[PDB]
Swiss-Prot record:
Regulated by bile acid salts. Up-regulated by cholate and down-regulated by taurochenodeoxycholate. A lipid is attached at residue 56 (N6-palmitoyl lysine). It catalyses: a 1,2-diacyl-sn-glycero-3-phosphocholine + H2O = a 1-acyl-sn-glycero-3-phosphocholine + a fatty acid + H(+); 1,2-ditetradecanoyl-sn-glycero-3-phosphocholine + H2O = 2-tetradecanoyl-sn-glycero-3-phosphocholine + tetradecanoate + H(+); 1,2-dihexadecanoyl-sn-glycero-3-phosphocholine + H2O = 1-hexadecanoyl-sn-glycero-3-phosphocholine + hexadecanoate + H(+); 1-hexadecanoyl-2-(9Z-octadecenoyl)-sn-glycero-3-phosphocholine + H2O = 1-hexadecanoyl-sn-glycero-3-phosphocholine + (9Z)-octadecenoate + H(+). Loss of activity upon alkylation of His-48 with p-bromo phenacyl bromide; Ca(2+) and Ba(2+) protect against inactivation. Its main location: secreted. It is found in: Secreted. It comes from the Eukaryota. The active site is at 48, 99. This is Phospholipase A2, major isoenzyme. Belongs to the phospholipase A2 family. Disulfide bonds join 11-77, 27-124, 29-45, 44-105, 51-98, 61-91, 84-96.
Length: 124
């Protein structure tokens, strides 16, 4: 679930700032998106979006209001390392892994302040 994704990000990036959640970044970090990602960090968010799109396409998976962000799973954090519980059901596991890979992706991507709250209607 979205709140768990935020938790994973803190796990992989302890120094991240909470207030950032009020902000969007690039063309894809935030809800929806358009055009092409502006940088590596933004690419991570687009890939995460694509990962969720794939999950929704699994006929075996149905999410509340068709939103994977509502799907709660089980995961654990240990020394900045994220582990998705093997007990998650197939749909939950897919979502957990999308979240995990995105969190890892975020942890390695450079952060460009100029891309925070970007004028998407113009650059996306
Ligand atoms: C982890 C990175 C980096 C933060 C940072 O300030 N780094 C400085 C540094 O490099 O040291 C941030 C930048 C924009 C954030 C996203 C936006 O706030 C939009 C949206 C907000 C949601 O609450 C959680 C998911 C996410 C996709 C957020 C995931 C994550 O929270 C992002 C992708
Ligand atoms: Ca997005
Ligand atoms: Ca669940």
């Amino acid at each position: 679930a979205l709140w768990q994704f935020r938790s994973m990000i803190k796990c992989a990036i302890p120094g991240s700032h909470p207030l950032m959640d009020f902000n969007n970044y690039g063309c894809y970090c935030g809800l929806g998106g358009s055009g092409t990602p502006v940088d590596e960090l933004d690419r991570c968010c687009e890939t995460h979006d694509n990962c969720y799109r794939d999950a929704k396409n699994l006929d075996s998976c149905k999410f509340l209001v068709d939103n994977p962000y509502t799907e709660s799973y089980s995961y654990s954090c240990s020394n900045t390392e994220i582990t998705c519980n093997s007990k998650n059901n197939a749909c939950e596991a897919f979502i957990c892994n999308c979240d995990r890979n995105a969190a890892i992706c975020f942890s390695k991507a450079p952060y460009n302040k100029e891309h925070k709250n970007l004028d998407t209607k113009k650059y996306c």
